[PDB]
Amino acid sequence: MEIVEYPDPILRAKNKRIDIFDENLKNLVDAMFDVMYKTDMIGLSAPQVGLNVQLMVFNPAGEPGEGKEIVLVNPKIKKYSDKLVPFDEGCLSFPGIYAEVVRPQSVKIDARDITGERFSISLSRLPARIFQHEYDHLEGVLFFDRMTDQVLDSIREELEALEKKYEEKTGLPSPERVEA
Ligand SMILES: CCCCC[C@H](CC(=O)NO)C(=O)N[C@H](C(=O)N1CCC[C@H]1CO)C(C)C
Ligand SMILES: [Zn+2]
Ligand SMILES: [Zn+2]
Ligand SMILES: [Zn+2]
Ligand SMILES: [Zn+2]
Ligand SMILES: [Zn+2]
Secondary structure (H helix, E strand, C coil), rough: CCCCCCCCCHHHHEEEEECCHHHHHHHHHHHHHHHHHHCCCCEEEEHHHHCCEEEEEECCCCCCCCCCCEEEEEEEEEECCHHHHHEEEEECCCCCEEEEEEEEEEEEEEEEECCCCCCEEEEEHHHHHHHHHHHHHHCCCCCCHHHHHHHCCCCCHHHHHHHHHHHHHHHCCCCCCCCC
């Protein structure tokens, strides 16, 4: 598969809810985990692999045979804690960019598993961190949108650089610019 990187429009387009839970969804999740493991990430969302569907995966442990392989489909955040905590984040769609993002420390969720059964779960610490980053993804939201002006100002060039790449390869004007 091929990894979708900023400022590709795929990461912004609305994503469709998954209504079919077959072996092709089982295989996609599997593949999504392999991409995650091979790229040394701890999570991954559908758009990042070129598929605009409401599907994500993550393993807090970040290592094969450790932690727990967690998968959520069509999730929805029922509540964000009032407490906001800072934490440094990276993103497979923005090769090389690391920064601080303030996010609520915990969260309550509603979602479906690899088969369709509706369920709820509450998250905290790192698991909550990963989920929110991915959930943002499922909603066309990228991590710099969450950063403060101060923090964004420190990655503008890296973002602009990426924008210059999209243009070099497509001869067209960057679909989105961080100048705007
Ligand atoms: C923590 C928020 C969840 C980040 C998920 C991203 C991968 C992802 O892009 N999902 O959409 C990741 O693995 N980035 C990692 C990341 O942000 N990490 C690795 C563990 C520590 C933390 C950085 O403080 C690294 C590999 C760049
Ligand atoms: Zn596999
Ligand atoms: Zn695997
Ligand atoms: Zn690693
Ligand atoms: Zn720092
Ligand atoms: Zn990401």
